[PDB]
Design a protein around this ligand. Structure first.
Ligand SMILES: O=C(O)c1ccc(-c2ccc(F)cc2)cc1
Ligand SMILES: Oc1cccc2c1CCCC2
Length: 181
């Protein structure tokens, strides 16, 4: 069978996380050390698209929601006290009106960003904790809806593409300048 969603959640936040950490020069394997096997050219399949889509869509949300991304971190001061409680309270903001592709893409970058900051200063120990909170929320606290709507292939096919993907950014000028009455 295909048995999708078998383990593309725990390493889903770490995959996008490293993509944002490598941009700063923090990496991830050095976060909690952990035994480093190797992984030279295991191939595997690398046919995932949610990662690529989450990349472009990542900066996408960072442009229209400028006011919505102002009271999301201010109420998440990293400190030796709260962690999943306040975190789930903030992520719930996007997962409240109703699980949606956008609410699922933004919450993604919201977590990967919370770690990029904690690691930017000097806290590379709470990265697995935050990445784990989002890993569970997607393990069984959202997957059931990701399929009810259609599947990652939907949000990844609607935008995840090389560049064309039949864009529609106000593309209402052609129409032969005289073919729509
Ligand atoms: O598609 C949606 O419904 C949707 C609505 C809002 C947001 C969003 C994204 C980033 C924020 F900091 C706040 C809100 C994402 C998706
Ligand atoms: O569906 C969309 C259409 C336009 C922009 C964005 C999304 C979804 C998440 C990223 C931002």
């Amino acid at each position: 069978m295909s048995m999708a969603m078998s383990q593309s959640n725990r390493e889903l936040v770490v995959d996008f996380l490293s993509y944002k950490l490598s941009q700063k020069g923090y990496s991830w394997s050095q976060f909690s050390d952990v035994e480093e096997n190797r992984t030279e050219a295991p191939e595997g399949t690398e046919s995932e698209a949610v990662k690529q889509a989450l990349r472009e869509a990542g900066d996408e949300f960072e442009l229209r929601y400028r006011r919505a991304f102002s009271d999301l971190t201010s109420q998440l001061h990293i400190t030796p006290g709260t962690a999943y409680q306040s975190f789930e309270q903030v992520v719930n903001e996007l997962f409240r009106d109703g699980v949606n592709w956008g609410r699922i893409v933004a919450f993604f970058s919201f977590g990967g960003a919370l770690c990029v900051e904690s690691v930017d200063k000097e806290m590379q120990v709470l990265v697995s904790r935050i990445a784990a909170w989002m890993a569970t929320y997607l393990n069984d606290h959202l997957e059931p809806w990701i399929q009810e709507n259609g599947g990652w292939d939907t949000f990844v096919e609607l935008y995840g593409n090389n560049a064309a993907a039949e864009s529609r950014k106000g593309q209402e000028r052609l129409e032969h300048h005289h073919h729509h009455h």
